[PDB]
Design a protein around this ligand. Structure first.
Ligand code: HEM
Ligand code: LC9
Length: 392
């Protein structure tokens, strides 16, 4: 019946031809392996994400507590979701952001100083993976002495959230990582409950729902939520950013001449190489897109990368171009989602990524690409295996 499958080996190598096929010939495409429909068009993805009543977040909550231990932001709605989401945003805004940024500069320069004498650096494996988890740890308030293990346990935890058909051995490891993470963080939450600091964990401890505070296991669940949410996409976007710029020397030069263009470059990178590729939702009642019928309980998976390359939303969608003027040839990209559950860390991510990119451009002179062709891996979250640059 249908022979093009998201789970073909060719898809993870290069999904762009699949994007083009699905939008034209099967915009709501059923995959029997996971009993879910994949949605490829910008307009349908946007409709799904903007109608939380019809397409809810019960899918995410399921295979998540096994590793989260309690309820995460996605499983919340109404005034609870708004209030707790505002609490988390408090940890990356106001005075917390003023204090956090100089620390992230320190993290960045410490990594640069570690590699500068070698005259090359892997933006993925030398910088991205290390900075991403340390930034998240600074945001939360976890001291960096054990960032090595924190990263290890995060990866096993993320693998569970971002995988579809994990075997019994893989499931048990991800669960062990979740327990090790919980063993490390509970004492920390106990300490900060006694002596508060200026970090996200302390914020969660001080939050007040009338006169009831978030229990210690829900603070950990939300802490793990933030650790996972903030770490994974940073590595990939940084690597994609410098790759696309170096693959387009002209645009790389424009960013050097007008450093203000770096924000536009990050946004175009998030559209072009969307690091979060899939957003699942659960259908709450009968519904039809084109002539594909959905039933209550069905699962739809928004294809963020496909939607951001939809020719109905962007002209020349498959070309990297930082000069895209929003003034249909341009639309707001879906890299941070949209609607009720849009990424709480969107503004922070843009600020943090611009900080890092500017510093890399300032300290690394005459950057030259060494990884002339990247190999990308992952279908749920996606990024290059390696992205090496050389410099003076
Ligand atoms: C380039 C970096 C990032 C990208 C591309 C990204 C992407 C996304 C996307 C697409 C969603 C929507 C998920 C859904 O609708 O089910 C989301 C949600 C979320 N993100 Fe991010 N994110 C990034 C960075 C961060 C950071 C730094 C944080 C720090 C806390 C964060 C925390 C969250 C949270 C808590 C949610 C859940 C929002 C809710 O349920 O209301 N993300 N993110
Ligand atoms: N906040 C980014 C984000 C959205 N969905 C995810 C799934 C796994 C890891 C990170 C993410």
């Amino acid at each position: 019946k249908v022979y093009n499958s998201i789970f073909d080996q060719a898809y993870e190598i290069d999904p762009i031809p699949y994007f083009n096929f699905l939008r034209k010939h099967d915009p709501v495409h059923y995959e029997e392996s996971i009993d879910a429909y994949f949605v490829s068009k910008y307009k349908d993805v946007k409709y799904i994400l903007k109608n939380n009543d019809i397409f809810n977040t019960k899918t995410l909550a399921k295979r998540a507590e096994p590793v989260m231990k309690d309820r995460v932001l996605a499983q919340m709605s109404g005034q609870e979701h708004k209030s707790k989401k505002k609490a988390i945003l408090k940890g990356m805004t106001g005075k917390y952001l003023e204090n956090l940024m100089p620390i992230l500069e320190k993290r960045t320069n410490d990594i640069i100083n570690k590699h500068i004498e070698k005259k090359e650096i892997d933006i993925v494996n030398d910088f991205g993976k290390v900075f991403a988890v340390q930034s998240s740890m600074d945001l939360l308030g976890i001291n960096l002495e054990n960032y090595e293990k924190i990263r290890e346990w995060h990866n096993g935890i993320a693998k569970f959230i971002t995988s579809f058909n994990l075997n019994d051995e893989e499931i048990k490891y991800s669960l062990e990582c979740s327990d090790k993470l919980e063993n490390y963080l509970m004492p920390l939450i106990k300490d900060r409950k006694k002596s508060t600091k200026d970090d996200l964990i302390s914020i969660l401890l001080e939050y007040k729902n009338d006169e009831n505070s978030i229990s210690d296991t829900e603070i950990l669940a939300l802490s793990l939520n933030v650790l996972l949410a903030a770490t994974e996409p940073v590595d990939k976007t940084l690597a994609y950013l410098f790759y696309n710029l170096l693959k387009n020397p002209e645009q790389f030069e424009s960013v050097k001449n007008n450093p203000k263009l770096i924000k536009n470059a990050i946004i175009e990178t998030l559209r072009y190489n969307s690091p979060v590729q899939l957003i699942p939702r659960q259908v709450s009642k009968p519904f039809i897109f084109n002539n594909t019928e959905l039933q209550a309980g069905d699962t739809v998976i928004c294809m963020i990368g496909s939607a951001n390359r939809d020719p109905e939303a962007y002209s020349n969608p498959d070309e990297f171009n930082i000069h895209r003027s929003s003034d249909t040839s341009h639309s707001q990209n879906l890299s941070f989602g949209t609607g009720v559950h849009t990424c709480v860390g969107a503004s922070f991510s843009l600020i943090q990524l611009e900080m890092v990119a500017i510093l890399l451009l300032k300290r690394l002179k005459n950057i030259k690409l060494k990884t002339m062709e990247i190999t990308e891996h992952g279908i749920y979250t996606r990024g290059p295996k390696s992205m090496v640059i050389s410099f003076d």
